[PDB]
Ligand binder design. Sequence first.
Ligand SMILES: [Mn+2]
Ligand SMILES: [Mn+2]
Ligand SMILES: [Mn+2]
Ligand SMILES: [Mn+2]
Ligand SMILES: [Mn+2]
Ligand SMILES: [Mn+2]
Lengths: 314, 314, 314
Amino acid sequence: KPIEIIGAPFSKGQPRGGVEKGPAALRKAGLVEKLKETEYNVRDHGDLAFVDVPNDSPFQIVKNPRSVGKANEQLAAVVAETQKNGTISVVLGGDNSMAIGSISGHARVHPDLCVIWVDAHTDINTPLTTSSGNLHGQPVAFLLKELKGKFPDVPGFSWVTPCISAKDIVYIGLRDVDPGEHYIIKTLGIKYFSMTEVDKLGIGKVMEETFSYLLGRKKRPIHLSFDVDGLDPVFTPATGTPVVGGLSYREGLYITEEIYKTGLLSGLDIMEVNPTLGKTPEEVTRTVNTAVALTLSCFGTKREGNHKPETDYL
Amino acid sequence: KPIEIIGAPFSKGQPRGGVEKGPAALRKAGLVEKLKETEYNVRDHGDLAFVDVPNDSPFQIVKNPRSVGKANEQLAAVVAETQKNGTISVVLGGDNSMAIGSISGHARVHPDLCVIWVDAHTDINTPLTTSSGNLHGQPVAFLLKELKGKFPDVPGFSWVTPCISAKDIVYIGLRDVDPGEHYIIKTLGIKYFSMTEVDKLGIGKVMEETFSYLLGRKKRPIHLSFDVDGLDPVFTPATGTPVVGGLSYREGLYITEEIYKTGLLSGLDIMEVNPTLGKTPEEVTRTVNTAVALTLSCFGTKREGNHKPETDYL
Amino acid sequence: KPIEIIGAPFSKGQPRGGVEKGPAALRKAGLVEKLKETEYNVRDHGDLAFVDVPNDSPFQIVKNPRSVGKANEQLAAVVAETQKNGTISVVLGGDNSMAIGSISGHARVHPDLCVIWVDAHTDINTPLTTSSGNLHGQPVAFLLKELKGKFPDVPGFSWVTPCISAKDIVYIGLRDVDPGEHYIIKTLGIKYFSMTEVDKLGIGKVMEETFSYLLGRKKRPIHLSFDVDGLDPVFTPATGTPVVGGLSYREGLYITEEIYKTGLLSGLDIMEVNPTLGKTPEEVTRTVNTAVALTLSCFGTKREGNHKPETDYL
Ligand SMILES: [Mn+2]
Ligand SMILES: [Mn+2]
Ligand SMILES: [Mn+2]
Ligand SMILES: [Mn+2]
Ligand SMILES: [Mn+2]
Ligand SMILES: [Mn+2]
């Protein structure tokens, strides 16, 4: 299938500006040029133009409710339109809040989708469980069918319809979960693999297990939402919430590598790359670079090597 | 059970001063503040006042014999007293010599205890095997029942009584063993897991195996003696003998995590944090931080997250 | 058996000068001094004197064809001579091209040998598949029985006789394979373990597997050719083609440690240590030091420790 890159230069999901610069950074590092060189057809849709919503009064504790909700509706419309034409959507963030419009727009055309969430955090805090009014920590709360009506109506998200049930999402890389969020996953029985399970089983067993758990009897589309902070800070330092002890550069490449093998990758998010938080210019190139490597891996690049078929090299 | 932190700001176990500053460093980093927020009752016993022993002439090659012995007798009395009151002892070093009075004081109330020793070194050198007269490399020699009368009588340890047999200690993280020490563990048949065994089996298999080997038929109390240099120098650089190729931040957190699960942790040592050996102020914070992280892990903190029971978060 | 170190201060196999300084760097770091302290007899054969071949015109695209072939014929002669006298050969590079004269000279005395190649690269490019005319990326191509007559006759390699078949070589550490090389290994069915297989299986499973694959029914001599770049750049930075996401210091030590245990190590190469590519003097010592550690591991040094037999330490 072909591919369509969508830039989502948004940052209202948290106080730290800088993330709207993620897609620029990634593009300038040669993302699209490199994607063309694979067996995939690549089209660059460009960057979406977001606009501030006037007098965006905080809803209780939640900041920039309407801005985020508006941004996400617009994104969801773009995603689903591109999806309809039979293409694999690739979204560049931007903060985690853009996960909302991505999975919504995807599910409109594929209600039988499943989400694989690589991150150090669950981002499953509701407007009532949050200690921060930042929406980048609440995307999975606006998407679950079992959490519908468990928290009020935030101004801006009226268009949102819970598109997946807890029984459809797997978490890999958890190491900084809030009490409220950990409750919701214990209660709703969401399948996860925090760092402890990774140490216990190995990345191999992890992929081996997430797969059967989702594609066991019914094979379905895969939506991989990748938060750059899921890997260790020594690999991807330019992010808003670096947390020590994460997945290694090798583990991140393995996750995506297996995802390719299934051939069901239908959507993909590359969130939280904040080019401005690099303690040095080098820390920025390091982060950007692994994000680009992660994206090429999902689209065919293997570490054992690659070569075009129908071409005798000897 | 409740907890009692005991500081042992002692450094006569080696030439490099600075280790006596470990408990200060750790306290200032918020150790006790964070322990209180767990399901345990915490009491800060304060720092022990040690005094130099006048004209502490070197015993053959062993330096500061009496100062160390005295320090440890005093520590053993404070541990056993606190132990008696049904509490979990937590010792902050200080160099490894304080391992002596810690295990002695512990065993006085629990002669059926077992020692889990995380370290890159065995510290089983006797006054006759030692190339250095530093007692921080000999603590396990003063505690073994099979080594009793295998080396003379050092001035100051006449009070010491071999409290464990070689069949009761397991080592994890060995990568810098002297010929004499390796001979003793080979001959005495001490169960260990050097880095090669960890590479071979994985951390899960290591804990899976140290457990059954000790709590196989008879469950007993556990005393975790943690030397900070067991982890890799890129995690805990502020220590006296950093050795390349160690356990990772993730592996250290996994060891401690499984220890919690058994519910048998009865004593705990956090040795060798030397705040003065940080090449930069950042290498000090890093070390300090992981030692604090390791401590909280033993007392309930999990990576998957935590939450208080009897409190509906939804 | 005894050991003989042979320096191969050659660098015409690539543009980056500096590698010819590898053996010096390694000797100055005390390599031979530390080798003596093991259970092996050590003799330092010294450094080979190579000479430029006048008007060494490029063969099609292959640069310095005759210089490389000459150096390698001379090396092959020195290796086989040393091997004839019942000694384990140890070659210090130098660029990867020297792998040619080493395996050739070894096989002259042990046609039944097998090769374990630790590298991020396969170096199996032929004069026709190469995008560069550098001979450091083609050593395995001049050695395979299945590739004989599949590429023309390079001026200088007429003396070479394909000594091993694809069914005799195992690759560990691949993460940067060209299309033509990946074709040759898929076609010829060469056994390998790129980084993904290591992630999937663990180093233990890799060694457990490469061994039976070679020593299954017929045990035979082992020739370990070690490319310093097979480990991660954060361990061995001073090399010509660092590729991120490699084997760790712990994994490298484990490979070599298991090799010792079989007792079949008959030849060994330590290629690609370029002392002039260190961003700082510290990056050089780091690299040099791990190569030295890798060498000592192959000859008896274990992480659990060692001690001389027939010597009561108590
Ligand atoms: Mn995150
Ligand atoms: Mn996230
Ligand atoms: Mn110790
Ligand atoms: Mn130690
Ligand atoms: Mn290489
Ligand atoms: Mn090579």
